[PDB]
Amino acid sequence: GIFGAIAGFIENGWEGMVDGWYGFRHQNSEGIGQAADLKSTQAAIDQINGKLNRLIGKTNEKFHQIEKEFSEVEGRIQDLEKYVEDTKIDLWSYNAELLVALENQHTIDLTDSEMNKLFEKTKKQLRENAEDMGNGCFKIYHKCDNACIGSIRNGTYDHDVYRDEALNNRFQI
Amino acid sequence: GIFGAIAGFIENGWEGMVDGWYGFRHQNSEGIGQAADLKSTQAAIDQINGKLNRLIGKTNEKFHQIEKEFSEVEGRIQDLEKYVEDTKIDLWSYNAELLVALENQHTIDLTDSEMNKLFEKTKKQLRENAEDMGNGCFKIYHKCDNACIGSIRNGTYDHDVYRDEALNNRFQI
Amino acid sequence: GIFGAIAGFIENGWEGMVDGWYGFRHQNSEGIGQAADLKSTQAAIDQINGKLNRLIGKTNEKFHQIEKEFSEVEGRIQDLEKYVEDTKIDLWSYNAELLVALENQHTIDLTDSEMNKLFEKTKKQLRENAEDMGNGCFKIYHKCDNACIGSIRNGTYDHDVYRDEALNNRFQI
Amino acid sequence: PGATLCLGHHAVPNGTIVKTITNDQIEVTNATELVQSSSTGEICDSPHQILDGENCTLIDALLGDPQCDGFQNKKWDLFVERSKAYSNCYPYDVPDYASLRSLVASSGTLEFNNESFNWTGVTQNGTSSACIRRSNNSFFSRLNWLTHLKFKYPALNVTMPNNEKFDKLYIWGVHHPVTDNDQIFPYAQASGRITVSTKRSQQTVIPNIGSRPRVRNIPSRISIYWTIVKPGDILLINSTGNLIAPRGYFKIRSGKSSIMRSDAPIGKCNSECITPNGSIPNDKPFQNVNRITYGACPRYVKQNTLKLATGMRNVPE
Amino acid sequence: PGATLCLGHHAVPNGTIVKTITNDQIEVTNATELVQSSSTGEICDSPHQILDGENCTLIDALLGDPQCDGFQNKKWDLFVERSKAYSNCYPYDVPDYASLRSLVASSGTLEFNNESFNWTGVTQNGTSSACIRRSNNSFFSRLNWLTHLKFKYPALNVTMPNNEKFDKLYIWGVHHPVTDNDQIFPYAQASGRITVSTKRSQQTVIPNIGSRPRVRNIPSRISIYWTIVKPGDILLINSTGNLIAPRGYFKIRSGKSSIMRSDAPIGKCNSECITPNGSIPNDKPFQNVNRITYGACPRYVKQNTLKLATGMRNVPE
Amino acid sequence: PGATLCLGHHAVPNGTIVKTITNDQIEVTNATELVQSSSTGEICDSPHQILDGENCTLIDALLGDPQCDGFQNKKWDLFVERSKAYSNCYPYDVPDYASLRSLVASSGTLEFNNESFNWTGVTQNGTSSACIRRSNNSFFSRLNWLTHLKFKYPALNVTMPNNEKFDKLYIWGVHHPVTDNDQIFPYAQASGRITVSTKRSQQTVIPNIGSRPRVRNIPSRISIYWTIVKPGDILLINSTGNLIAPRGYFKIRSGKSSIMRSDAPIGKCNSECITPNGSIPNDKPFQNVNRITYGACPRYVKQNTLKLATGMRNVPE
Ligand SMILES: *[C@@H]1O[C@H](CO)[C@@H](O[C@@H]2O[C@H](CO)[C@@H](O[C@@H]3O[C@H](CO[C@H]4O[C@H](CO)[C@@H](O)[C@H](O)[C@@H]4O)[C@@H](O)[C@H](O[C@H]4O[C@H](CO)[C@@H](O)[C@H](O)[C@@H]4O)[C@@H]3O)[C@H](O)[C@H]2NC(C)=O)[C@H](O)[C@H]1NC(C)=O
Ligand SMILES: *[C@@H]1O[C@H](CO)[C@@H](O[C@@H]2O[C@H](CO)[C@@H](O[C@@H]3O[C@H](CO[C@H]4O[C@H](CO)[C@@H](O)[C@H](O)[C@@H]4O)[C@@H](O)[C@H](O[C@H]4O[C@H](CO)[C@@H](O)[C@H](O)[C@@H]4O)[C@@H]3O)[C@H](O)[C@H]2NC(C)=O)[C@H](O)[C@H]1NC(C)=O
Ligand SMILES: *[C@@H]1O[C@H](CO)[C@@H](O[C@@H]2O[C@H](CO)[C@@H](O[C@@H]3O[C@H](CO[C@H]4O[C@H](CO)[C@@H](O)[C@H](O)[C@@H]4O)[C@@H](O)[C@H](O[C@H]4O[C@H](CO)[C@@H](O)[C@H](O)[C@@H]4O)[C@@H]3O)[C@H](O)[C@H]2NC(C)=O)[C@H](O)[C@H]1NC(C)=O
Ligand SMILES: *[C@@H]1O[C@H](CO[C@H]2O[C@@H](C)[C@@H](O)[C@@H](O)[C@@H]2O)[C@@H](O[C@@H]2O[C@H](CO)[C@@H](O)[C@H](O)[C@H]2NC(C)=O)[C@H](O)[C@H]1NC(C)=O
Ligand SMILES: *[C@@H]1O[C@H](CO[C@H]2O[C@@H](C)[C@@H](O)[C@@H](O)[C@@H]2O)[C@@H](O[C@@H]2O[C@H](CO)[C@@H](O)[C@H](O)[C@H]2NC(C)=O)[C@H](O)[C@H]1NC(C)=O
Ligand SMILES: *[C@@H]1O[C@H](CO[C@H]2O[C@@H](C)[C@@H](O)[C@@H](O)[C@@H]2O)[C@@H](O[C@@H]2O[C@H](CO)[C@@H](O)[C@H](O)[C@H]2NC(C)=O)[C@H](O)[C@H]1NC(C)=O
Ligand SMILES: *[C@@H]1O[C@H](CO)[C@@H](O[C@@H]2O[C@H](CO)[C@@H](O)[C@H](O)[C@H]2NC(C)=O)[C@H](O)[C@H]1NC(C)=O
Ligand SMILES: *[C@@H]1O[C@H](CO)[C@@H](O[C@@H]2O[C@H](CO)[C@@H](O)[C@H](O)[C@H]2NC(C)=O)[C@H](O)[C@H]1NC(C)=O
Ligand SMILES: *[C@@H]1O[C@H](CO)[C@@H](O[C@@H]2O[C@H](CO)[C@@H](O)[C@H](O)[C@H]2NC(C)=O)[C@H](O)[C@H]1NC(C)=O
Ligand SMILES: *[C@@H]1O[C@H](CO)[C@@H](O[C@@H]2O[C@H](CO)[C@@H](O)[C@H](O)[C@H]2NC(C)=O)[C@H](O)[C@H]1NC(C)=O
Ligand SMILES: *[C@@H]1O[C@H](CO)[C@@H](O[C@@H]2O[C@H](CO)[C@@H](O)[C@H](O)[C@H]2NC(C)=O)[C@H](O)[C@H]1NC(C)=O
Ligand SMILES: *[C@@H]1O[C@H](CO)[C@@H](O[C@@H]2O[C@H](CO)[C@@H](O)[C@H](O)[C@H]2NC(C)=O)[C@H](O)[C@H]1NC(C)=O
Ligand SMILES: *[C@@H]1O[C@H](CO)[C@@H](O)[C@H](O)[C@H]1NC(C)=O
Ligand SMILES: *[C@@H]1O[C@H](CO)[C@@H](O)[C@H](O)[C@H]1NC(C)=O
Ligand SMILES: *[C@@H]1O[C@H](CO)[C@@H](O)[C@H](O)[C@H]1NC(C)=O
Ligand SMILES: *[C@@H]1O[C@H](CO)[C@@H](O)[C@H](O)[C@H]1NC(C)=O
Ligand SMILES: *[C@@H]1O[C@H](CO)[C@@H](O)[C@H](O)[C@H]1NC(C)=O
Ligand SMILES: *[C@@H]1O[C@H](CO)[C@@H](O)[C@H](O)[C@H]1NC(C)=O
């Protein structure tokens, strides 16, 4: 949420995109398509796996400890034993609550960041050949067939090739 | 601070804006005005209330505990009782200090984010009809009366209506 | 990493920049140069010093405590003494681990933010006189000698002076 | 000509300073205090059941020192012990006083059921000048001072089983006579002994002939012990002299009860959190009033103040 | 005409709700549970060495109650005590039972070396009807009940040094006779006493003549004590009556051993983390199964569930 | 033609690896160590007042074993006990040795005021061959060994009130004679007893006739006890034999004092934080040197190293 892409200027997610987390939809002369972006998807996934590696399978061995249940009333020493354990559990419970709340805020923000970076990267790529429609979509002011769209997704789009065509379309009356 | 809007490219805040946290000032043919943006204001406010709901009115009941003051010298057992309590208080004091420092950094950053998102949203809206002056203000290259300014604030501004007028003003000599 | 400048759209760092953390490289009629930006460098440095001031030289005095090593087997009371100390050390060890991991994520992100803000500030400054090449570099569409480059670095660049020259270069065929 | 549209944010003339991760002093538009640092000075009598000890310690009310007669069978969520308290019955000590005090406090009731022990071979109901009840030499209401019957004292052997479904709590003791002027007068022989046992436990005690420094003019002492008897179990009292006997048992319960040392007055008000300084509100997550608390309370921390920002950075005009 | 290129992200039809810093209910595409809240119900016998106490407490196996004869010299990582356990030898108590239990549990072995004490001036190997071993009046296997030799009982004075490199653990006791029918029968005099000392330590105990409430039809008691003797040090037993003597010493080790109260059955499976409810997996960092654990275990917390997001915010189509 | 303007950041040839929330190995331009992991090996004698025990335990200096005579009335912030220490006076034990040691350590002074007790009816100043002071049979400087006067020993009854504004600390004891060769020689009768009481407290002790294993050739023992007497209160010593008496009281203070076990040498240097391994600097917030510390110290953690990034991510050229 903190970057403004996911649940912000991108109206909603795509349930039909099942082979990636982020990607592209286009409309051109040859039809309407969709392709996943692997690099941004893998960036988000690696970061979340990084968090998982810190939390899953990382336990601590403990052996002989203090007693934690009692069948007789004893006073002072039993009070202290119960108090120590109750103190400890509240501190760990606090740690677990805070951890999840913070990690979750950060997971939501990093994933929004990855969407935003891909959008930004794509905008720079298009130079003067397109305009931002404000909803995550670019209007491209030149004929851009499937190979051309593929060139943008693959980072091989040469903006000089189309620039005369696009400037002429952009600054008409 | 992390997005660069508040205490960054926006020179300062407006003490005269009392009905919102974020908003618009304009100069046009009909004068100079101000209107608050409710959606961005409410976004920031909801997030801060979210933090408040986690921290205010959420206490823990405790009943019989250990003694924490002593009128006689006793040694070993009293040392342990005092130590347990001093240990506990230092850990909670640490938790409280860290909580406030982190939440405060995050509150400052989220509020800066909301300013930045509104700015960004407004820039996309204007398309080729305005330019960013670098201080949070746009120079709009067309006649834009009170209804037009209102259309931008309300998200109903139609950029095609003014585009010929604006392109002609923008690319003059 | 969260803003996308450092280890993102800026391919790599400059080992040859030894007098600042962030800065400018240019190519113009008069050659190829480099100058550090002090304000962005000092912004990042102050924030990291802020973290240091919270962590370095801030210790707690403790005096008489409990015993933590034992030469005789004793049972119940010794179990509790050992347990209290082991509990405490695990909680502090947890605090230290989490602190470093979070502060380090945040240091990496704030430094990326400072790069991004300088880039953004410079882009707005150039108005219609340059285009973003997508790798942190701007193509400037006018003659821009050493004094002109200096004017951009110093925040005194007057974009109107070059605008006719630049628009003409930008929208050619 | 055109127009200009400027995006912006509010600011206030009266900002507040907060701490952050990167800066110990940043001004924000608004903040709220997370540490509660004040009490009204009174312990609110609601919603917890408060029992003001007044002149009585819990232990004096338990043993039944005459000035504590009004406490018989009372319950409490929180028993409040006053610094002005004092004992005014027979001088005594309790080995592990702190544990008995704690376990009664936590039980939260003084409910006492009388029991008929087969005391034949002794004079029951011994009294003294140091324990004045209703302007007449008396004793601890829950104890039964046992002395001789006609220059003789045979081997006692009394039994009492627990058929109930709660732990029974038995309070009993030993008399330690000041000289041989009260070792041949109330017990009729040179030596004495007491053995209070159960199926699982045994406690035995030797009376001690010797003078002590006077406490309200009396140089003898009693020593107080206790015994918990579970369901299905039995209490046995073998005795050859000196027994300070129970008149019955206390019920021991479990729940939320406790005890607190405080001189704060009791007020007619409603507050969930009690400290020795008085009740405090519990809106805030933390407090620096007292490490000793009872109820739904903020957590004790060392800091006086912790300000949480509730607005953006303040950047004045 | 041109083209349109839209950037976007996935969404799912089945999102999950998580907590965040600013919102207690945000839907994400996916999450994983951090709190382990279930056991299979069985304690896995691997990879920790489990010793099922069955009918025996650790203490009964230590003293050598006949039904615990199969436990002699066994070791354990974890000794499991069952609620169905019961003693069936001579009635006894252990002052500070909890500490002896703990130190044996932690030592993790019942290794016992026999020792030849110079017992002349008494009858060794006293037995009773309450401790039936192999259908014959017997006693605790590791204790030696010492009585008279021909209407007499002189002052014992036996010595035994520790030349080994481990702490020796000596278990010993006192007999408390029911009346004078077993104070003049097994010891031949009015009075008795026991003094078990070392270079650094001394413990002395008085036998107690008196009737107790019957426990499996016996109204006498033994009281059990212990003594640790280090390398270079010596054990001394001065005794004038009533001694329940050691037959030797237990080895005390240090390591990872402990004891747990549980009725869960032992399974033929492999699990690092044991609770009283059974073994639990330890993939998750936290657990709400039991505050009592043994092995590489998740940390106990009060929460039932804590969901960590493993995907972006879900914004359905 | 125009120009090109590139924005960028620095990098270094020698980066350092740090941990983050999302990556356990990220290279940054610079970092600093947060865990202190080394000591110089010496305890700095400033700014805390150090008292090197040398051959003496705190308890030996307290009782006044002749080799500890130089410690009389000294104060300390930190008393250092050496592993080479040993006692060389009369053999003794202290029930709850650890508590007496702790409360003296914490008091931080050996200030002793002599007091004139009315000892008539006994021979004062008993000595022995095992406590050699100035090449002459002697005793513990702060104790007064009390024996008979002409084949007789009557019932002692000495009183001493505390009119001061500090707690008085009284150290006293019992002699346990090896046989009847030193039960009829120094006390003139079959039996003995000691009762040290106050207005609030009473402790009574029985001497024990019996041989112990020799410790520096002596088979008798003393047992050491203590009594705290508050302002307005009084000390009473009833005794019928065997008393090891105080010569006066220790002042008990409160403050920052403690005790530490260490063999590290004392250096002429200034360091706020002391561990048993030596002083350590306290610039860093954490340390893995020792869980035992004294002074303004970093907090003990299990980790060897924790690197905090002090620069951006390093992305080499
Ligand atoms: C600076 O920042 C703080 C925090 O964001 C703001 O203070 C909050 O303001 C709101 C609205 O004025 C307060 O809401 C009110 O809570 C009352 C409960 O009082 C006690 O309990 C709360 C915890 O629940 C304690 O924090 C508090 O100190 C009190 O002890 C209610 O009684 C109020 O109800 C009244 O108004 C509502 C209108 O919606 C009606 O429904 C009711 O009938 C009734 O008349 C109300 O809900 C909130 O308590 C404040 N919080 C704190 C922590 O102080 C400041 O407003 C802000 N300053 C500026 C200038 O913006
Ligand atoms: C929602 O989010 C979660 C977390 O990101 C995803 O669940 C993970 O999915 C991966 C891949 O399917 C799982 O990886 C597998 O781990 C198995 C180990 O099982 C136990 O141990 C782990 C901890 O290590 C526990 O968390 C887990 O509950 C088990 O008790 C391995 O046996 C698997 O190996 C198999 O596949 C690999 C293929 O690479 C082969 O090499 C092997 O031969 C073998 O066939 C595998 O490594 C991971 O365990 C899951 N984690 C959790 C916490 O559940 C969900 O996939 C995701 N959901 C969606 C729809 O995206
Ligand atoms: C990598 O990152 C670290 C941390 O940002 C940098 O190290 C710091 O560098 C500064 C400046 O060189 C150091 O500042 C100096 O502190 C000295 C105090 O020494 C002790 O106390 C500190 C805590 O206060 C400990 O951390 C430290 O280990 C020492 O034990 C002062 O004596 C210095 O004063 C001298 O210089 C100043 C100039 O301003 C003069 O005023 C004085 O007269 C005097 O000559 C100075 O203030 C700081 O101690 C370092 N911190 C740490 C934690 O190491 C590295 O510089 C950085 N590396 C690179 C390549 O950038
Ligand atoms: C609780 O006790 C007080 C105090 O009374 C006692 O003070 C002791 C120090 C000691 O001197 C003792 O002998 C004395 O009785 C009671 O207040 C006192 O009550 C007496 C008799 O009614 C009056 O003469 C006094 O005015 C009064 N003194 C003070 C200082 O107030 C009080 O009655 C009692 N409270 C309850 C609820 O029982
Ligand atoms: C563990 O002990 C059980 C229970 O046996 C005892 O139960 C006590 C309450 C008491 O009545 C005591 O006298 C009794 O011996 C043993 O199971 C019992 O074994 C007996 C004799 O073999 C059988 O007659 C019963 O069927 C059986 N009872 C039950 C309820 O199962 C059990 O043998 C023993 N286990 C081990 C491993 O030693
Ligand atoms: C602290 O004591 C040491 C050690 O002296 C004792 O060692 C014991 C194990 C035991 O044998 C005992 O009888 C012996 O006295 C003192 O050092 C020793 O001092 C003696 C007499 O001056 C010398 O003959 C030795 O050289 C010397 N031995 C060693 C190993 O150093 C030391 O004097 C004393 N220190 C202080 C400050 O009192
Ligand atoms: C032991 O000594 C105390 C103190 O001297 C005796 O108690 C005093 O006795 C007198 C006269 O008998 C009383 O009037 C005082 O009240 C007591 N004084 C104090 C200060 O308590 C005690 O009687 C002596 N023991 C014996 C057996 O005589
Ligand atoms: C609440 O009561 C406590 C306990 O009396 C107060 O803390 C003590 O304050 C006195 C006088 O300032 C100090 O001499 C003590 O050292 C303090 N004791 C402890 C244990 O900290 C506290 O000031 C009171 N708080 C309020 C808000 O009234
Ligand atoms: C002390 O009292 C108990 C209880 O009355 C006596 O134990 C009982 O004695 C009878 C007959 O001798 C036995 O058959 C019972 O088994 C016992 N009953 C209970 C309930 O335990 C005990 O013997 C008495 N002491 C003496 C010395 O006679
Ligand atoms: C594991 O066992 C514990 C202990 O018996 C269970 O917790 C108890 O549950 C009972 C019945 O619900 C309550 O009456 C007790 O108050 C609980 N005791 C404690 C100490 O919390 C627990 O429910 C079991 N857990 C699982 C997952 O089976
Ligand atoms: C109890 O036994 C011990 C050990 O045998 C006796 O102490 C020994 O006595 C001899 C000769 O009297 C001494 O020379 C030795 O130094 C002692 N040996 C050891 C190993 O300590 C002790 O005297 C005996 N008790 C009685 C009353 O005679
Ligand atoms: C400081 O001293 C401690 C205590 O002796 C050292 O920790 C011990 O190290 C030894 C030998 O490596 C181990 O056998 C012990 O198990 C350790 N004890 C504890 C309690 O951890 C420690 O290594 C020393 N540290 C430094 C930096 O010198
Ligand atoms: C600022 O001033 C107003 C009006 O006096 C006051 O109600 C408000 O609480 C103040 N805010 C802060 C943060 O001090
Ligand atoms: C002892 O006193 C109680 C209470 O006043 C009374 O009921 C009882 O009859 C007395 N007992 C005897 C044996 O006189
Ligand atoms: C969503 O549905 C799939 C298929 O039924 C399932 O495997 C997956 O775990 C579900 N995910 C969540 C987060 O509920
Ligand atoms: C006592 O019993 C043990 C074990 O059965 C036996 O070896 C020993 O000879 C017996 N001792 C005597 C003195 O009879
Ligand atoms: C890198 O090299 C310099 C010069 O050798 C050194 O002073 C500096 O501390 C090094 N920095 C790191 C982070 O290793
Ligand atoms: C006991 O010794 C002390 C110290 O040397 C001395 O002052 C005192 O006079 C002696 N006491 C007697 C009664 O001789």
CATH number at residue F140: 3.90.209.20
On whether the CB atoms of residues E245 and E146 are closer than 8 A, the answer is yes
Interface with chain A: mutation pick from D59, D100, D101, D102, highest number of A CBs within 10 Å: D102
Distance CA F132, CA B72 (A): 37
| Residue whose C-alpha is closest to residue F142's, from F74, F203, F65, F88 | F65
Resolution in A: 2.2
Rounded distance from Cα B57 to ligand 12 centre (Å): 46
CA dist list (Å): B9 to B6, C23, C111, F162: 7, 18, 18, 75
Distance CA F124, CA D284 (A): 66
Distance CA C100, CA D93 (A): 54
Distance CA C156, CA E188 (A): 115
Residue F144 half-sphere exposure, CB side, CA atoms within 13 Å?
16
- Three-class DSSP category at B7: coil
Query: How near does any CA of chain D get to the CA of E1, in Å?
Result: 31
Strand ranges, E, within F231-317: 234-239, 243-246, 248-251, 258-261, 266-270, 273-275, 278-280, 286-287, 295-297, 299-300, 307-309
Q: Which residues line ligand 13 (CB under 6 A)?
A: D 14, 16, 30
Distance CA D9, CA C95 (A): 37
On whether the CB atoms of residues E98 and C75 are closer than 8 A, the answer is yes
- Three-class DSSP category at F151: coil
Is A154 exposed, middle or buried, given 0-12, 13-18 or 19+ CB atoms closer than 10 A? exposed
Q: Which residues line ligand 18 (CB under 6 A)?
A: F 124-125
Give partners of F (≥3 CB pairs < 8 A).
A, B, C, D, E
Residue A6 half-sphere exposure, CB side, CA atoms within 13 Å?
32
Is F260 exposed, middle or buried, given 0-12, 13-18 or 19+ CB atoms closer than 10 A? buried
Q: Do E21 and A102 touch (CB under 8 A)?
A: yes
| Residue whose C-alpha is closest to residue F1's, from C125, A166, C124, C172 | C172
Q: Do F21 and A50 touch (CB under 8 A)?
A: yes
**Residues from chain A contacting residue E298 (CB–CB below 8 Å):** 59
Atom of ligand 13 minimally distant from the CA of D15: 13
- Strand B137-140 and strand B130-132: the pairing is antiparallel
- Three-class DSSP category at E263: coil
Considering only the beta carbons, identify the residue of D176, D212, D223 that sits closest to F236.
D212
| Residue whose C-alpha is closest to residue D87's, from D63, D51, D56 | D56
**Residues from chain B contacting residue F99 (CB–CB below 8 Å):** 74-77
Distance CA C18, CA B130 (A): 39
Rounded distance from Cα A46 to ligand 15 centre (Å): 20
Which position has the token pair 């000698």? C145
One-letter amino acid for residue D37 of the chain = S
- Strand E128-132 and strand F16-18: the pairing is unpaired
Residue E161: CB partners within 8 Å, gap ≥ 6? E233, E234, E235
Q: Give the method of determination.
A: X-ray
Angle of helix D97-107 versus helix A76-126 axis, rounded to 10: 60
Which position has the token pair 């732990």? D167
On whether the CB atoms of residues A126 and A140 are closer than 8 A, the answer is yes
- B4 Rama sector, left if φ>0, alpha if ψ -120 to 50, beta otherwise: left
Residues paired with F6 in a beta bridge? C25, C137
Distance CA B21, CA C126 (A): 30
| Residue F276: cis peptide before it, omega within 30 degrees of 0 | no
Query: How near does any CA of chain C get to the CA of D123, in Å?
Result: 44
**Residues from chain E contacting residue B106 (CB–CB below 8 Å):** 21
Taking the CA of E10 as reference, the closest ligand is 2
Residue of E158, E159, E239 with the most ligand 11 atoms within 8 Å of its CB, for mutation: E159
| Residue whose C-alpha is closest to residue E19's, from E272, E265, E217, E303 | E303
- E48 Rama sector, left if φ>0, alpha if ψ -120 to 50, beta otherwise: beta
Q: Which two tokens stand for residue E11?
A: 């969404």
Residues paired with E144 in a beta bridge? E245
| Count of helices and strands (H, E) across chain D | 2, 29
Distance CA E58, CA E72 (A): 11
| Residue whose C-alpha is closest to residue A74's, from B10, D226, F142, D139 | D226
Q: Which two tokens stand for residue E212?
A: 């107790």
- Strand F202-205 and strand F194-197: the pairing is antiparallel
DSSP string across E269-293: EE-SEEETTEEE--SSSEE-S-S--
On whether the CB atoms of residues E291 and A85 are closer than 8 A, the answer is yes
Q: Which two tokens stand for residue C81?
A: 């003494």
On whether the CB atoms of residues F277 and F290 are closer than 8 A, the answer is yes
CA E58 to chain centroid, in Å, comes to 5
Interior CA angle at D96 toward D90 and D102, to 5°? 95
**Residues from chain F contacting residue D209 (CB–CB below 8 Å):** none
On whether the CB atoms of residues E36 and E306 are closer than 8 A, the answer is no
Query: Residue F140 phi/psi, 5° resolution?
Result: -60, 120
Distance CA F216, CA F239 (A): 29
Q: Which two tokens stand for residue A86?
A: 């109750």
Distance CA A103, CA A87 (A): 24
Domain with A77, as residue range(s), is: 1-173
Q: Do C80 and B77 touch (CB under 8 A)?
A: no
Distance CA E301, CA E286 (A): 6
Domain with D190, as residue range(s), is: 49-264
Query: How near does any CA of chain E get to the CA of F165, in Å?
Result: 37
CA dist list (Å): E316 to A22, A38, D94, E309: 14, 21, 71, 17
Is F177 exposed, middle or buried, given 0-12, 13-18 or 19+ CB atoms closer than 10 A? buried
| Residue whose C-alpha is closest to residue F119's, from F95, F144, F151 | F144
Residue F228: CB partners within 8 Å, gap ≥ 6? B72, B73, F167, F168, F169, F170, F252
| Residue whose C-alpha is closest to residue E194's, from E226, E156, E221 | E156
Distance CA E102, CA A19 (A): 57
Q: Which two tokens stand for residue F101?
A: 């040691």
In this structure, the residue with its CA closest to atom 3 of ligand 5 is E55
Q: Do F21 and A53 touch (CB under 8 A)?
A: no
- Tell me which long-range contacts C72-76 makes (C-beta under 8 A, separation of at least 24): C72/E228, C73/E103, C73/E167, C73/E228, C73/E252, C74/E99, C74/E103, C75/E96, C75/E98, C75/E99, C75/E100, C75/E101, C75/E102, C75/E103, C76/A77, C76/E96, C76/E98, C76/E99, C76/E102
Distance CA F301, CA F308 (A): 15
On whether the CB atoms of residues D150 and D185 are closer than 8 A, the answer is no
CATH number reported for the structural domain that contains residue B109 in this entry: 3.90.20.10
| Residue whose C-alpha is closest to residue A26's, from A158, A162, A157, A153 | A153
Rounded distance from Cα D76 to ligand 10 centre (Å): 28
Q: Do D213 and F236 touch (CB under 8 A)?
A: yes
Q: Which two tokens stand for residue C78?
A: 């010794």
On whether the CB atoms of residues F104 and F95 are closer than 8 A, the answer is no
- Strand F299-300 and strand F286-287: the pairing is parallel
Distance CA D259, CA D108 (A): 9
One-letter amino acid for residue C55 of the chain = L
Distance CA C104, CA D12 (A): 34
Distance CA B37, CA F147 (A): 97
